[PDB]
């Protein structure tokens, strides 16, 4: 039951990286 | 062992070549920061290619539009000023790094056996770099560009019978004009890729035997993997180079250049002072030290002839200047002489600089004339210095 | 017309192999009734019955522990002492081993020949073993000679002579032993592992000691050692087999009268000179040895730490194997499977060493030079996997194997007496089998993951290697392979 | 949880065993096909179950050279009902351990586990010996690991010499090697193993001995799996003749070795077996390569003479290998490559010395006590108990009590030791040397010493 | 099943066409199974007796020689060919069964394919 937690962690990482490259604060 | 199962992904066929050439390659543990400059030159080449690909999206290779297209890159495209300052000063960084590289090789006698092919490929690479940077400097179509292109294409006229036909074939006409600029653009896109291939061949030749070291001795007893040790050392070098390059880009973007190239090319008037980029100045000085067309071109060719013949001189069996006091001193004299030739190239052709240039050119050739004598004589050192 | 399928030689061989395969295709169910390849946790506290272990404390703190089997014809009686090289000093280091050599060298009543003649006249055996934290002297005798063996042990412990000529002869025996530290490379590798892992602590010293110490050994040194360490509260007299608790207690009360009674106590000694782990390595490169041997270890657990049981389960999970084992490719241990399937070692062995305040948990391997890189990758992978992925089947199988080995190795009077003495020294009590089994079955997959994350994950390691080890990965590569960056 | 120095709370403690437990009695049930099942109930929670077969290398002649040791390596592999992988997994599920041993006249297959797993143990053991699949790849793998097991043989001088003098001491079946040559293995295969095993593995030649199980359960599980086996009439083991012989492999270098052996009575003849064992204890000795632990034989004639009167000796002791109708008593030795003649002189002189009567009563009582304590102590182990039951029921069918052996040991006088040693060395000797044999004397010169 | 030649005539035409195409080259259908396609085939081939594998290899060499020469077997040789006489399928199925048994009990694979 650790692969699901790894997937969630890496999904959070991917989201953080997305908001960081494109920085869509003027669109949200 | 029998490879029934999969071990490290690094040792799988997908990754094995990269692993053995880049992660696990045995490297002498005592390499200094002077072994960081090959990777620095590699990074400079990638920087030039990336910035030049993006700049070619906005540059127009036409005599009626080239200067204006540069200015439009500087003023109109967002981050254009950065892309241009990065390409123009990255050429200078490339040449600084490659010069430091060549002088490490000269100080440690890295050209000696069994690494002669490495040195010869490096000489070919240096020629490619010179041609690439020159034809790139023609592209803005300023005064410097036009007049430098004029003289370099004219160099072919030193050949007695077919020299004029070669000059007119290079131009594409009876003068430097739009045909010259357009063909120089194509060559400028092409030559960087040949440079990449030549650099890969250079690296493969070097990994035939591995790197030389600051002691100049056999190093098989104390080698360590490239990753991570020399990875992190080269990273220190990469960050320091980034600081240096950033200082040039953001605070002194035009100090390594001449204001004449901000004037559009005028085929009527030659500027009172006409010089190439700084990294070509020593060759300029050697050229002008000969009071003869053919003599000057022949001296320019003899420079690279001497560089190519250096590894094949019968020498002593001692590499590093760390154990060769006479060769070490001759090294520091050659470095001073090269710096003097560069400074002289920037001066007008008049007294006292003609004599100084002539003597400096003589000293430069004396280095390559004297090294074989040093090797032949020093062959007798172990028989004359007894314990 | 084509040939019939037995004319050509290759067709006939194909028919034979096909017939054998069809024979295997249909199993017989009478032989498939009871055994299962799936491990099940079983509770069998009925068969777990054992004779009572009686523990009596004398007024001076001496403990007498007996396990009676009056149907036995033999017995094992001995003394287990909370003493060893760890409790010496730097200048006294090696004294315990010298005493082990000197203890059967004669007393006031008995000379060397008398002592040997008395023992081997009854067919007995006398054994002396010293380690870092434990020392034991015991006798294996017939049931009749229990009192005689106890008298022999009490005499040698209390009334040894230590003649100067005997001391000088043993001095050269031990000096030659130090000069001949070879041929037992496992022991050498573990000594160097202890020396680097427990650097600048009493636990890092060897049992043998330095040559200058053995050269400097005199009578008063040995007498002072016995006075300092062989005290009533640090000694356990253990007997197993055909022995009655009451007779042994009476004999011990009669014979063990002139002990030391020094106030020095082992807990304080461990407290003021504690043992700590230092991540480090020693590489003894010798390219003339045909095989490489190395050990990789983490800091483990002490005897009384509850995690020690989980570390035993984990050691069983890693397992041990050598090239003469028939079925290494099929065992539950993934590390053993990798090693046996790819032929990448001569031997592999996981160890779990416990001490009073620390421990060592690691793997010892013997392999050829060209197998070392893959072997190290496999060892690190399977050890680090314990912090991430543990299947219920693997931990269940390991629990079953550990319980089985603990009960099966306990056969004979000597192993039982050793178990009694060791447990009384390390735990203060003999842990009954039912409690030990209950502690073992409390180790589930989540427990193994928690313990591995405490002891193995992103942790410093100690390495000791000898032989053609130029292709053994360096300390940074072993240290990187203690965590997985995909999690 | 709690520290291990504090008892765990809430644990169900089973009642303790009595300090005096009445020993159980061996029950021997014979099946109509001739298979004998024996067991003894034991108080400890461990069960040892074995199958013992009166097959060995004395049946390989002439066309099965190497079959016995290959069968030893092929034990507990793939059956017709279970794959090797499944069988290893079933053994490990219950925390069991397997073992197989091959000898000149006996083979055994044993499994050890907690006594609650007896049905699984019995089922796995019979499937293994009755239904070998003998898959070609498994046989080939066990044959590669047989080459190593035979090449590393030169690293054990005692074992190498022991086999070599078995070869050089007999002529018939007993002379067949127990470690076949490499040429003899390129012929062995699965079909050969099946043909050999089917011929020799019969019910009337096999005993199921189980130490630590109730006989009812063992019968309930084992009867339905062995009765099918047909009745095969009892043949006779072949005869071997003891002769003289010399074994010599001049390898050169250093560290010579030797073994001088003589013939002694077999396991049949139950007063002289003992005389051989007590003789072996009397000569005694030690490996001389390691020390530690008094009472292991440091004050026997061999030790006290050689290792305490002549230095530069690397090994010296005595050995014994008794079969059903014959045996081998001998003395080992290492010495030094040029000291070899003196070493053989010393050994021969020691045999002659005990032959004449130069041994006093103190040494006789010492060796007698050593014999009795060695036999009584070796029965501490459950494994040895089970193996002894199996071997004795195979050989005698009775499991004679140890008390009879103890009286024979304590009925030995000096006159017996003297007449037996005189008889033993009046017959041809078997000489074996290994290492640098150039300086080692001839067979005739050593034979003339006795 | 529809792939049964006795029950379905379309499968009969399919089997006849495959047999005729195999017979032109002297190839068995099991000869088309390549060790490089899967590690299960490689293992099954390694478990086969040597003479069978040598016969397979000889048939493969003969077929390659015919194909390179743009030739078929002579009709006299074609008459004796047994295109659907099997030597591999039973061993392949046994290897697959052993593989599945290993997977079900949580054991590591006995062999794995290299990542290209
Ligand atoms: C300048 C070159 C730029 C390259 C920089 C990189 C340096 C390098 O690779 O490592 C060296 C150095 C040490 O690294 P290392 O590998 O440990 O050491 C290797 C050496 O062999 C360590 O050997 P060492 O311990 O013997 O130290 C000697 C060391 C440095 O130590 C010394 O040099 C000691 C000498 C001190 C003076 C002695 C007394 C003087 C006598 C009296 C007066 C007579 C002469 C007057 C001179 C006064 C000084 C100006 O010398 C060098 O390494 C060479 C430096 C000078 C080379 C020649 C410079 C020519 C440029 C023009 C200046 C002069 C020309 C004439 C113009 C006239 C106007 C002034 O770098 C560092 O400090 C750390 C490196 C960290 C990363 C940097 C690399 C990446 C750079 C990014 C690219 C940017 C461009
Ligand atoms: C134009 C742009 C192009 C580039 C220009 C710069 C050219 C520089 C080329 C450098 C040559 C590269 C080869 C390096 C070999 C020399 C070296 O590394 O250091 C020498 C020594 O270098 C020198 O002697 C340097 C001479 C120049 C010094 C003057 C330059 C200014 C630097 C002085 C410091 C700053 C002062 C400024 C005022 C405050 C000793 O090296 P080894 O023999 O390997 O011994 C190292 C090991 N160990 C010392 C421990 C034994
Ligand atoms: C032109 C520019 C000039 C030079 C610029 C330099 C550019 C290259 C930088 C220098 C080398 C960097 C290469 C870094 C790779 C390191 C790989 C590594 O550390 O591997 C880790 C893991 O990383 C990988 O494996 C990634 C590689 C994937 C394969 C494709 C750890 O591996 P392990 O062996 O400890 O265990 C993991 C095992 O390999 C996997 O089973
Ligand atoms: C670009 C080309 C230039 C052309 C130059 C024109 C022709 C000149 C060619 C000669 C080169 C000039 C520089 C030679 C002198 C270098 C300085 C030197 O070597 O002095 C050493 C002093 O010792 C000498 O070497 C003096 C030797 C004089 C020459 C004797 C010649 C006989 C040897 C012939 C051997 C030939 C091969 C030698 C290989 C090294 C340094 O001593 P040290 O560094 O070990 O320590 C002292 C210092 O205080 C602390 O650093
Ligand atoms: C680009 C910048 C992105 C920054 C983070 C990217 C991933 C960083 C961690 C991944 C990583 O290095 O793991 C290695 C990748 O391995 C492999 O190539 C195989 C493993 C399978 C891939 C799983 C990796 C994690 C998924 C991350 C993707 C999401 C990224 C979103 C930002 C294996 O390293 P190890 O230590 O586990 O191996 C030790 C076993 N001996
Ligand atoms: C009549 C009696 C005749 C007796 C025999 C005489 C000797 C004949 C054979 C001489 C040896 C080979 C002659 C080579 C001709 C070279 C070209 C020449 O002379 O100029 C012609 C001709 C120019 O003649 P121009 O008009 O007088 O300058 O050459 C060209 O058109 C340009 C080609 C020359 C450069 C090519 C590139 C070189 C680098 C390649 C990388
Ligand atoms: C630090 C690393 C040292 C290696 C590279 C040297 C570059 C930094 C040294 C400072 C001199 C560079 C400079 O200002 O040159 C412009 C230098 C003086 O500044 P300017 O006269 O105001 O343009 O003049 C030139 O344009 C000369 C051409 C550059 C030659 C130096 C090579 C770089
Ligand atoms: C394929 C890669 C490359 C492309 C597509 C490229 C493209 C260009 C373009 C479009 C220009 C004209 C715009 C301008 O002046 O800024 C230019 C100028 C130049 N390029 Fe490149 N280039 C490449 C690689 C290189 C390399 C490797 C060097 C150095 C060896 C170099 C040196 C120069 C120089 C010196 C100039 C004149 C810069 C100035 O004063 O403005 N380029 N390049
Ligand atoms: C684009 C230009 C170049 C690139 C990317 C490049 C790349 C490299 C690299 C990565 C190395 C190994 C690491 C190091 O020693 O720094 C190396 C070594 C070397 N290079 Fe180059 N190089 C270039 C130009 C040259 C030139 C112009 C020469 C000489 C005329 C040369 C001669 C050598 C030699 C002799 C070595 C061996 C160094 C040793 O073993 O000590 N290279 N090069
Ligand atoms: C005042 O004077 C001067 C300048 O001015 C300001 C200069 O800048 C320079 C700088 C020039 C140097 C150092 C040398 C340049 C060297 C070469 C070789 C460039 C010549 C190459 C050219 C023009 C392009 C190559 C053409 C090709 C390959 C044709 C393609 C054909 C086919 C693919 C078939 C110097 C010396 C000079 O004194
Ligand atoms: C032990 O070995 C190693 C060294 O010590 C000898 C090194 O010095 C270096 C650094 C050397 C390099 C790569 C510099 C050479 C210069 C080159 C080739 C510049 C051109 C760069 C490109 C485009 C890379 C070409 C390669 C490929 C496969 C193309 C695809 C890749 C990209 C698009 C980036 C590395 C990484 C190394 O480990
Ligand atoms: Zn010792």
* String of DSSP letters for B37-71: HHHHHHHHHHHHHHHHHHHHTT---STTTHHHHHH
Instruction: Note if the bond before B47 is cis, omega within 30 degrees.
Output: no
Give the separation between CA B327 and CA C360, rounded to whole angstroms: 57
| Minimal C-alpha gap between E47 and chain D (Å) | 6
Tokens found for residue C302: 């002490």
* C-beta atoms surrounding A6 within 10 Å: 13
* Joined tokens for residue E72: 């078929």
Whether there are 3 or more C-beta pairs closer than 8 Å between E and A is no
Tokens coding C390:
């543990």
Two tokens at C166? Answer: 């005997």
Residue D447 structure tokens: 């034979």
Tokens standing for residue E82: 């047994």
Domain boundaries, chain B: 1-387
Q: Is the distance from CB of D161 to CB of D228 less than 8 angstroms?
A: no
B350 is catalytic: no
Local structure of B344: helix, strand or coil = helix
What angle do helix axes B116-138 and B178-209 make, rounded to 10 degrees?
Answer: 160
Does residue C242 contact residue C70 with C-beta atoms inside 8 Å?
A: yes
- What SS3 class is residue E100? helix
Residues from chain D contacting residue C439 (CB–CB below 8 Å): 1, 4, 8
- Distances from the Cα of B173 to the Cα of B179, D97, D277, angstroms: 8, 94, 116
Order of strands across the sheet that contains C235-241:
C53-57, C63-68, C235-241, C74-81, C135-142, C125-130
Cα–Cα distances (Å) from C246 to C79, C152, C252, C256, in that order, read: 17, 19, 10, 15
User: CB distance from E105 to chain D under 8 Å?
Assistant: yes
Residues 6+ apart with CB under 8 A from D295: C116, C119, C120, C124, C125, C126
**Three-class SS state of B224:** strand
Of C172, C141, C153, C68, the residue nearest C110 (C-alpha): C153
Burial class from Cβ neighbours inside 10 Å (0-12, 13-18, 19+) for residue C336 reads buried
SS (H, E, C) chain D: CCCCCCCCCCCCCCCCECCCCCCCCCEEEECCCCCEEEEECCCCCCEEEEEEECCCHHHCCCCCCCHHHHHHHCCCCCECCCCHHHHHHHHHHCCCEEEEEECCCCEEEEEEECHHHHHHHHHHHHHHHHCECCCHHHHHHHHHHHHHHHHHHHHCHHHHHHHHHHHHHECCHHHCCCCCCHHHHCCCCHHHHHHHHHHHCCHHHEEEEEECCCHHHHHHHHHHHHCCCCCCCCCCCCCCCECCEEEEEECCCCCCEEEEEEEECCCCCCCHHHHHHHHHHHHCEECCCCCCCCCCCCCCHHHHHHHHHCCCCCCEEEEEEECCCCEEEEECCCCCCCCHHHHHHHHHHHHHHHHHCCCCHHHHHHHHHHHHHHHHHHCCCHHHHHHHHHHHHHHCCCCCCHHHHHHHHCCCCHHHHHHHHHHHCCCCCEEEEEECCCCCCCHHHHHHHC
Nearest to B65 by CA among B166, B145, B140: B140
| Residue ranges lining ligand 11, Cβ < 6 Å | B 22, 25, 27, 38-39, 42, 45-46, 196, 199-200, 203, 211, 226
| CA pair distance E50, E54, nearest whole angstrom | 6
> Residue B265 gets which letter from DSSP?
P
Both tokens assigned to B169? 């074939």
HSE toward the beta carbon, residue C104, CA cutoff 13 A = 21
Which token pair is B377?
């004589």
Pairing of strands C347-354, D316-322: unpaired
Element containing residue B325 per DSSP (H, E): helix B325-345
Q: Which of B31, B32, B95 to mutate to test the pocket of ligand 2 (most atoms within 8 A of CB)?
A: B32
CB C260 within 8 A of CB C234: no
At residue D243, φ and ψ (nearest 5 deg) are: -130, 180
Measured CA to CA, the distance from residue C84 to residue C137 in angstroms comes to: 13
The residue among D338, D327, D381 whose CA lies nearest residue D112 is D381
With CA atoms as reference, report the closest residue to C48 among C473, C457, C440, C442. C440
CB D431 within 8 A of CB D438: no
Contacts 24+ apart (CB under 8 A), C303-306: C303/C354, C303/C355, C303/C356, C303/C426, C303/C427, C303/D4, C304/C426, C304/C427, C304/D3, C304/D4, C304/D5, C305/C359, C305/D3, C305/D4, C306/C439, C306/D1, C306/D2, C306/D3, C306/D4
Residue B188, annotated ligand binder? yes
- Please enumerate, as own/partner, the contacts of D377-384 that have beta carbons within 8 Å and a separation of 24 or more: D377/C74, D377/C140, D379/C73, D380/C72, D380/C74, D380/C411, D380/C412, D380/C413, D380/C414, D381/C411, D381/C412, D382/C411, D382/D42, D382/D44, D382/D46, D382/D48, D382/D112, D382/D211, D382/D212, D383/C411, D383/D48, D383/D110, D383/D112
Q: Do strands C74-81 and C280-285 pair parallel, antiparallel, or not at all (unpaired)?
A: unpaired
The CB-side HSE value for B234 (13 A sphere, CA atoms) comes to 16
Among protein residues, the one with the nearest Cα to ligand 3's atom 4 is B39
Contacting chains of B (3 CB pairs or more, <8 Å) are C, E
| Chain Cα centroid distance, residue C138 | 18
Measure D100 CA to nearest chain E CA, in Å: 25
CA B110 to chain CA centroid, nearest Å = 17
D67 touches D60 (CB < 8 A): yes
Task: Kindly report the three-state secondary structure assignment for every residue of chain C.
Answer: CCCCCCCCHHHHHHHHHHHHHHHHHCCCHHHCCCCCCCCCCCCCCCCCCCECEEEEECCCCCEEEEEECCCCCEEEEEEEECCCHHHCCCCCCCHHHHHHHHCCCCECCCCHHHHHHHHHHCCCEEEEEECCCCEEEEEEEEHHHHHHHHHHHHHHHHCECCCHHHHHHHHHHHHHHHHCCCCCHHHHHHHHHHHHHCCCCHHHCCCCCCHHHHHCCCHHHHHHHHHHHCCHHHEEEEEEECCCHHHHHHHHHHHCCCCCCCCCCHHHHHHHCCCCCCCEEEEEECCCCCCEEEEEEEECCCCCCCHHHHHHHHHHHHCEEECCCCCHHHCCCHHHHHHHHHCCCCEEEEEEEECCCCEEEEEEEEECHHHHHHHHHHHHHHHHHCCCCCCHHHHHHHHHHHHHHHHHCCCCHHHHHHHHHHHHHHCCCCCCHHHHHHHHHCCCHHHHHHHHHHHCCCCCCEEEEEECCCCCCCHHHHHHCCCCCCC
Does ligand 9 come within 6 angstroms of the Cβ of B226?
Answer: no
The DSSP output letter for B264 is: B
The contacts of residue D115 (CB under 8 Å, 6+ apart) are C47, D42, D45, D46, D47, D212, D213
Q: Residue C349 pairs with which residues in a beta bridge? A: C320, C364
Catalytic residue among B58, B72, B207, B293: B207
- Gap from CA of B104 to ligand 2 centroid (Å): 10
Q: Does the N-terminal peptide bond of residue B114 adopt cis geometry, omega within 30 degrees of 0?
A: yes
Report CA dihedral (D97, C451, C353, C210) to the nearest 10 degrees: 150
How many residues are recorded in chain C? 487
Q: Which of the other chains make 3 or more beta carbon contacts under 8 angstroms with chain C?
A: A, B, D, E
Instruction: Supply C338's token pair.
Output: 């990798």
Answer whether B9 sits within 8 Å of E110, measured CB to CB: no
Determine the Cα–Cα distance for residues B177 and D334; give it in Å rounded to an integer. Answer: 100
Cα-Cα-Cα-Cα dihedral of C304, C308, C310, C311, to 10°? 180
Closest CA to C376 of C341, C335, C332, C325: C335
Among C219, C245, C118, residue whose Cα is nearest residue C164: C219
Rounded CA separation B285/B340 (Å): 9
Tokens of D385: 């108990």
Q: Pick the residue from chain E with its C-alpha nearest to D78.
A: E98
The C-alpha atoms of residue D309 and residue D304 are separated, in whole angstroms, by 7
CA distances from C131 to C84, C98, C213 (A): 6, 12, 18
Residues of E in contact with B5 (CB under 8 A): 108-109, 111-112
- Report helix angle B353-378 to B281-289, nearest 10: 100
Strand order in the sheet with D430-435: D245-250, D430-435, D257-264, D327-331, D316-322, D285-286
Q: Are C425 and C419 in contact (CB under 8 A)?
A: no
Strands (E), B151-278: 223-225
Do residue C389 and residue A2 have CB atoms under 8 angstroms apart?
yes
Query: Distances from the Cα of B321 to the Cαs of A1, B30, B103, B330, E27, in angstroms?
Result: 62, 16, 12, 10, 70
Residues 6+ apart with CB under 8 A from D433: D161, D247, D248, D256, D257, D258, D259, D340, D440
Q: Which helix (H) or strand (E) holds B127?
A: helix B116-138
Alpha carbons E70 and E78: distance in angstroms, whole number = 16
Say which DSSP state B225 is in: E
Residues facing D111 on adjacent strands: D49, D98
Mutate to test the pocket of ligand 4, among B109, B314, B326 (most ligand atoms within 8 A of CB): B326
Distance between CA D340 and CA D315 in Å, rounded?
12
Strand partners, D100: D109
Residue C212 structure tokens: 């200058």
The rounded distance, in Å, linking the Cα atoms of D275 and C236 is: 41
CA distance B96 to B103: 11
Q: How far apart are CA E33 and CA E85, in angstroms?
A: 14
Q: How far is CA D115 from CA C8, C287, C432, D258, in A?
A: 54, 50, 19, 46
* C-alpha distance across the termini of chain D, in Å: 72
Tokens matching residue C74: 């033999």
* Contact present, D213 and D120 (Cβ < 8 Å): no
Distance CA D43, CA D24 (A): 9
Instruction: Choose the catalytic residue: C170, C299, C346, C418.
Output: C170
For residue B163, give the ligand nearest its CA.
Answer: 6
Q: Is D246 exposed, middle or buried (0-12, 13-18, 19+ CB in 10 A)?
A: buried
* Pocket probe mutation, ligand 9, options B104, B115, B122, B196, max atoms within 8 Å of Cβ: B122
Cβ neighbours of C377 (radius 10 Å) = 19
Catalytic residue flag (residue C281): no
What gap in Å lies between CA D374 and CA B196, rounded to an integer? 81
Ligand 6 pocket check for B309: Cβ under 6 Å: no
Residue with tokens 């040429």: D183
What is the total residue count of chain B? 387
Whether residue D85 and residue E105 make contact (CB cut-off 8 A), yes or no, is: yes
Give the residues across from C238 on adjacent strands. Answer: C65, C78
Active site residue B207: yes
Residue A19, judged by CB atoms within 10 A of its CB (0-12, 13-18, 19+), counts as exposed
């Amino acid at each position: 039951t650790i692969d699901i937690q790894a997937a969630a962690g890496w999904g959070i990482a991917a989201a953080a990286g997305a908001i960081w490259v494109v920085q869509p604060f003027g669109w949200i | 062992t029998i490879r029934n199962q999969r071990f490290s992904l690094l040792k799988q066929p997908i990754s094995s070549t990269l692993n053995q050439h880049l992660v696990d390659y045995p490297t002498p543990s005592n390499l200094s920061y002077w072994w960081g400059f090959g990777s620095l030159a590699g990074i400079c080449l990638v920087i030039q290619i990336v910035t030049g690909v993006f700049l070619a999206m906005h540059y127009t290779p036409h005599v009626d539009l080239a200067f204006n297209s540069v200015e439009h890159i500087m003023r109109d495209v967002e981050g254009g000023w950065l892309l241009r300052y990065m390409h123009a000063n990255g050429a200078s960084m490339f040449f600084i790094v490659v010069y430091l590289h060549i002088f490490r090789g000269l100080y440690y006698a890295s050209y000696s056996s069994p690494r002669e092919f490495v040195w010869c490929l490096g000489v070919v690479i240096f020629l490619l770099m010179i041609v690439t940077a020159f034809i790139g400097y023609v592209l803005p179509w300023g005064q410097m560009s036009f007049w430098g292109a004029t003289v370099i294409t004219s160099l072919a006229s030193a050949i007695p019978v077919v020299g004029d036909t070669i000059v007119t074939w290079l131009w594409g006409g009876f003068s430097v004009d739009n045909a010259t600029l357009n063909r120089f653009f194509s060559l400028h896109y092409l030559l960087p890729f040949i440079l990449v291939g030549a650099s890969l061949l250079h690296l493969a030749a070097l990994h035939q035997y591995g790197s030389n070291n600051p002691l100049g001795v056999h190093s098989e007893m104390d080698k360590i993997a490239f990753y991570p040790y020399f990875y992190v050392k080269d990273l220190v070098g990469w960050v320091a180079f980034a600081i240096f390059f950033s200082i040039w880009i953001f605070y002194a973007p035009n100090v390594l250049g001449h204001p004449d190239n901000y004037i559009p090319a005028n085929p009527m008037s030659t500027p009172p002072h006409i010089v190439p980029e700084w990294y070509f100045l020593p060759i300029y000085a050697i050229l002008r030290s000969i009071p003869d067309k053919a003599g000057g071109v022949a001296a320019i060719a003899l420079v690279f002839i001497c560089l190519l013949a250096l590894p094949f001189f019968k020498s002593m069996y001692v590499r590093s200047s760390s154990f060769r006091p006479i060769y070490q001193g001759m090294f520091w004299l050659l470095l001073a002489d090269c710096l003097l030739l560069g400074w002289i190239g920037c001066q007008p052709v008049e007294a006292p600089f003609v004599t100084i240039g002539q003597i400096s050119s003589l000293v430069f050739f004396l280095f390559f004339a004297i090294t074989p004598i040093l090797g032949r004589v020093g062959r007798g050192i172990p028989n004359s210095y007894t314990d | 017309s084509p040939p019939p399928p037995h004319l050509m030689p290759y067709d006939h061989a194909a028919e034979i192999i096909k017939n054998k395969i069809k024979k295997l295709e249909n199993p017989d169910k009478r032989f498939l009734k009871y055994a299962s390849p799936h491990p099940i946790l079983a509770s069998h506290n009925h068969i777990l019955s054992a004779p009572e272990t009686r523990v009596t404390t004398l007024p001076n703190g001496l403990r007498v522990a007996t396990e009676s089997n009056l149907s036995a014809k033999t017995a094992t009686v001995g003394v287990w002492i909370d003493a060893g090289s760890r409790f010496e000093s730097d200048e006294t280091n090696g004294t315990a081993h010298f005493l082990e050599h000197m203890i059967f060298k004669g007393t006031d009543r008995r000379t060397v020949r008398a002592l040997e003649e008395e023992i081997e006249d009854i067919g007995g055996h006398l054994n002396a073993y010293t380690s870092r934290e434990q020392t034991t002297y015991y006798a294996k005798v017939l049931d009749s000679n229990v009192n005689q063996a106890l008298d022999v042990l009490a005499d040698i412990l209390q009334n040894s002579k230590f003649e100067e000529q005997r001391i000088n002869r043993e001095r050269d025996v031990i000096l030659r032993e130090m000069q001949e530290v070879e041929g037992q490379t496992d022991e050498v590798v573990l000594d160097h592992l202890h020396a680097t892992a427990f650097q600048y602590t009493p636990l890092g010293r060897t049992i043998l000691g330095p040559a200058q110490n053995v050269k400097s050994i005199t009578r008063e040194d040995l007498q002072n050692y016995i006075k300092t360490h062989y005290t009533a509260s640090r000694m356990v007299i253990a007997a197993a087999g055909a022995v009655k608790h009451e007779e042994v207690v009476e004999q011990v009360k009669k014979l063990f009268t002139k002990l030391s009674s020094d106030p020095t106590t082992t807990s304080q000694l461990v407290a003021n000179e504690p043992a700590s782990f230092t991540g480090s390595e020693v590489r003894m490169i010798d390219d003339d040895l045909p095989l490489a041997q190395f050990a990789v270890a983490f800091e483990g657990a002490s005897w009384t730490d509850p995690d020690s049981v989980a570390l035993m389960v984990m050691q069983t999970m890693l397992g041990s194997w050598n090239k003469n084992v028939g079925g290494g490719k099929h065992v539950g241990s993934d590390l053993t499977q990798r090693v046996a399937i790819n032929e990448i070692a001569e031997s592999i062995m996981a160890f779990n060493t416990n001490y009073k305040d620390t421990g060592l948990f690691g793997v010892y391997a013997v392999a050829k030079a060209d197998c070392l890189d893959d072997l190290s990758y496999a060892i690190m992978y399977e050890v680090t996997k314990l912090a991430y992925r543990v299947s219920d089947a693997d931990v269940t199988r390991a629990r079953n194997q550990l319980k089985s080995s603990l009960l099966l190795h306990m056969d004979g009077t000597s192993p039982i007496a050793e178990d009694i003495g060791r447990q009384l020294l390390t735990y203060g009590r003999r842990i009954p089998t039912a409690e030990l089994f209950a502690r073992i079955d409390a180790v589930d997959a989540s427990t193994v993951k928690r313990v591995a994350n405490k002891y193995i994950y992103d942790k410093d390691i100690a390495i000791s290697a000898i032989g053609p080890i130029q292709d053994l990965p360096d300390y940074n590569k072993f240290r990187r392979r203690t965590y997985w960056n995909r999690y | 949880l709690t520290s291990l120095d504090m008892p765990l709370q809430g644990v169900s403690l089973p009642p303790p065993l009595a300090d005096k437990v009445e020993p159980s009695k061996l029950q021997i049930t014979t099946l109509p096909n001739g298979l004998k099942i024996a067991s003894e109930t034991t108080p400890n929670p461990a069960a040892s179950i074995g199958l013992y077969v009166d097959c060995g290398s004395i049946y390989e002649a002439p066309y099965f050279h190497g079959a016995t040791h290959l069968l030893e390596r092929m034990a507990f592999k793939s059956t017709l009902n279970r794959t090797h992988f499944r069988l290893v997994r079933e053994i490990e599920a219950i925390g069991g351990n397997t073992s197989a041993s091959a000898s000149r006249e006996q083979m055994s297959y044993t499994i050890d586990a907690l006594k609650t797993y007896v049905p699984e143990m019995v089922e796995v053991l019979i499937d293994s010996v009755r239904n070998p699949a003998f898959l070609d790849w498994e046989v080939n793998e066990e044959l590669r690991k047989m080459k190593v097991e035979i090449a590393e043989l030169a690293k054990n001088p005692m074992g190498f010499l022991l086999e070599a003098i078995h070869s050089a001491g007999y002529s018939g079946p007993l002379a067949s090697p127990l470690y076949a040559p490499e040429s003899a293995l390129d012929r062995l295969n699965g079909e050969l193993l099946e043909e050999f095993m089917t011929e020799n593995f019969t019910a009337a030649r096999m005993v199921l001995a189980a130490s630590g199980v109730e006989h009812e359960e063992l019968l309930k599980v084992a009867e339905p799996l062995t009765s099918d086996l047909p009745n095969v009439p009892p043949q006779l083991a072949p005869k071997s003749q003891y002769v003289g012989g010399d074994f010599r492999q001049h390898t050169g270098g250093e560290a010579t070795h030797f073994a001088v052996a003589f013939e002694v009575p077999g396991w049949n003849n139950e007063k002289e077996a003992v005389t051989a064992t007590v003789l072996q204890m009397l000569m005694g000795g030690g490996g001389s390569f390691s020390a530690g632990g008094p009472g292991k034989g440091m004050h026997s004639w061999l030790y006290r003479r050689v290792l305490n009167e002549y230095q530069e000796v690397q090994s010296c002791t005595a050995f014994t290998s008794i079969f059903n109708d014959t045996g081998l008593f001998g003395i080992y030795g290492c010495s030094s490559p040029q000291f070899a003649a003196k070493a053989i002189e010393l050994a021969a002189k020691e045999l002659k010395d005990v032959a004449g009567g130069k041994v006093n009563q103190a040494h006789l009582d010492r060796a007698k006590a050593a014999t009795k304590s060695a036999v009584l102590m070796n029965l501490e182990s459950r494994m040895i108990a089970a193996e002894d039951i199996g071997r004795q029921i195979l050989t005698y069918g009775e499991r004679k009590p140890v008390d009879q052996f103890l009286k024979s040991v304590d009925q030995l006088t000096l006159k017996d030791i003297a007449d037996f040693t005189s008889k033993v060395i009046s017959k041809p000797l078997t000489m074996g040397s290994f290492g640098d044999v150039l300086a080692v004397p001839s067979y005739d010169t050593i034979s003339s010493k006795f | 099943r529809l792939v049964d030649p006795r029950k379905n005539f379309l499968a009969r035409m399919h089997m006849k066409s495959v047999s005729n195409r195999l017979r032109r080259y002297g190839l068995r259908y099991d000869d088309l199974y390549d060790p490089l396609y899967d590690l299960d085939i490689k293992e099954a081939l390694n478990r086969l007796p040597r003479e069978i594998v040598d016969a397979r290899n000889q048939r493969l060499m003969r077929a390659m020689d015919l194909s390179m020469k743009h030739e078929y077997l002579p009709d006299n040789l074609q008459a004796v060919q047994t295109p659907f006489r099997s030597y591999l399928q039973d061993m392949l199925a046994l290897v697959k069964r052993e593989r599945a048994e290993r997977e079900a009990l949580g054991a590591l694979p006995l062999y794995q394919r290299t990542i290209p």
